[model samples]
Target: ECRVLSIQSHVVRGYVGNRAAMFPLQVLGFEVDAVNSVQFSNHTGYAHWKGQVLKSQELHELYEGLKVNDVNKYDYVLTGYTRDKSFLAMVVDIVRELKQQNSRLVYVCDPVMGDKSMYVPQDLLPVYRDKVVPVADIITPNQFEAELLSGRKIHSQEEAFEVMDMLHCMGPDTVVITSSDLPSSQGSDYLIALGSQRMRKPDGSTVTQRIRMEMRKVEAVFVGTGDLFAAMLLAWTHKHPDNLKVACEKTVSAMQHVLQRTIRCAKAEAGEGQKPSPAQLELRMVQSKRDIEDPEIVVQATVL
Candidate 1:
């Protein structure tokens, strides 16, 4: 029975942040335990939702306590969206020790840095690229963070492939770049899931998959979608092992399903011509495995 333990911020104090992803992971058949990285009153998008981030020292104590109780055993450790680097360093240390005790332990680092359009705070970016990326068994970085880690502006498919290679050579055997768009490609925006050259084809092709979605005219990008991706990928990877290509396809397909459903919900709620409400943009973070089994409305995943 593979298990996943994660540290992530909870939305506000009431809305559960990890639950969105955790529910989807459980649907994929994984036992999951999650700790709150930060607890706020509500998502910051709404006014009057101010909150505090958990201190690094507090998180360190929690990790040490878990180890003291001999409850530190976990097959997979997944992380996302760190506002504090010191806390991230503590997580890395805890994960490193756990991996040493259990050689089968795997760490999936979702470097929730900036995306193609927005960059996070200046200080946290370096911590993500330097300390976190090297220790991860797998990484989920959007194109902007990938560019930050590798320092290559990936503007073309050739450049995207180059970025993927550079990321794998850094440390992690698997890399999943989300929200990547190539200006040269016509009529498509994409999410790429790729692994090391060891999985390459004879024709110099890497074993990979891309979920290319038609660009939609929508407002307000949904929060936590990438976090959901990281969680689902971790769960799928537990079932698939080092088979990153298959895991990538599963994750992308799951997200595409959620996004398409979200879009339809929004359109129906807002009338034919109106834009979706803010709440309407949220992807249906399904709570069980049965949600992913709908073969009737399939998600798009193209394997290489």
Candidate 2:
């Protein structure tokens, strides 16, 4: 079994960050070791929550302990949100050290800065752009993040292509723009999930295989979907390195299953006419274990 070291946020009572990621990876057969960057009472989407963020020294000490035990061997390293610039720098150092220890390690970085509605601290953006992105083997950034990372606007498919190319130049062999809205679909209730895999040809040229999938918009907002998507992508890509389309198809299929299940559960708990609280809106990750392992819905991916 492949081993992964995942560093991200953790919530005691809900799914997001490590709480959202670890379970899916485990269900997909990877041995996962997690380091929590923040330990929250619940996810921040809740009306009330509290947590302590780990300092850089604390994270370093944990990594040092792993190093001392001679158990630092990892096939992959996955990282999500890091709120502080200092903490993100520490994470970059950890990634560097882990890669040095195991040259074959693949780093899957989910550049979790912000979404359309909310944004993170201003300083941490450059940390991801300059330090973290260059070291990653794979990156999953949503549309908003892709634009920020590439320093280009992505309003159309052509622009998205240009942006992904710019991102490829940055370093990752594979780039997945986890969510985007194309200009052509501005008035529609559909979203696009796009992915590209870069391979160097024998003739010293490079070619990229691109795939796109369209999904209907789900009505309700659910936290942790991005985290879940990134984890599933990492596992599926590891399982199908040469077939990104298949990997994406499987990932989307599994996500739809989990989302539908969670929505149904949420509706049931909310009862008639009552708005579900964020705590009540927590993902049904545990209940959707079987779906994570073997999703019933098989969404197809088309090569572009």
Candidate 3:
């Protein structure tokens, strides 16, 4: 009875965008319809990568086709990694139409700016600030994106919460800074991620839950992790509504399992004293299938 409209990039080779998100959601039992925002030969992390960007008209035609066929309904909407300014506006418009048709449809948006700066067009940031965030139910942004959206820098845990609060005011009921550079209380060798969910009880009261999490830093880099994070959070959120701590715990733990498997597999192939290549470090998504289905609670959440 659950369906997701996942608009994301498509990679012919490797786990990224649709390749990373589609299989997991399907394994968890949601029927998914995917539109390629970009069709790529491989993820851009490779030294030589090629792709074709989707035009705004093409997206509209596809949506029109679904409507003509009488099958455009969805329980959830998800998206990641967009670069085209005009195309993103089209996305926002489509999402609004869907929400109008079904108020229960949740849109989980991962604002895919680069780790340190804007990867998409600088001008496009305005569209997100003005239109996109306002329509989304949940938003997953890295530190740089949260800064761009809130127009504030995060230098402390309190500052991070304030940024998330600003995002809540913008529109989304849930805001998650998926990764941040804020100092981890445990150690320097860890990374921090925070989540906040604003839920309404039947009594017409609001209950907002905020949480902080720590994950041991993996010394290697991998593309497509953001897409995976957004998907995991959406799936877990559906399973545990109003419980941000449990949902985030499952989301982060699943991510940890996949990354750990990929790194260990990459290291084994790299052998002693040599670094693993990007291709070697490609995530072992297929091998980590069980964990993604029902992840062991490897990461813990601190309710705040």
**What do the candidate models score in CA lDDT, each in turn?**
0.68, 0.87, 0.90
Q: Using TM-score as the measure, which candidate wins?
A: 3
Candidate 2 lDDT by residue in tens digits, 1-304: 8998998889999899999999999988999999998899998788788989888899999999998999878999988877788988988998898889888789999998987653679888888899999999999999999999998888888789789989988989999987887732434776788888997788999789998877767778899888898899899898888789988888898888888888788888998877777777788999989888877656777798
Which segments of candidate 2 are over 4 A away from where they belong?
A: 183-187, 201-205
Q: Estimate, for each residue in 75-191, the C-alpha lDDT of model 1 and write its tens digit.
A: 888888876668888887878888898887878888887875444566877777777787787888877888988987877766777787777777676777766655423333433
Provide TM-scores for the models: 0.83, 0.95, 0.97
Q: Compare candidates 1 and 2 on TM-score and give the better one.
A: 2
Worst 10 residues of 2 by lDDT: 181-190
Number of clashes found in candidate 1: 7
Candidate 1 minimal-lDDT segment of 10 residues:
209-218
By TM-score rank, best first, the candidates go: 3, 2, 1
Candidate 3: tens digits of C-alpha lDDT, residues 182-244: 889899989899899888889999878889999999999898898888998999999998888
Which parts of model 1 are misplaced by more than 4 Å? Answer: 12-17, 183-186, 189-220, 268-272, 287-289, 293-304
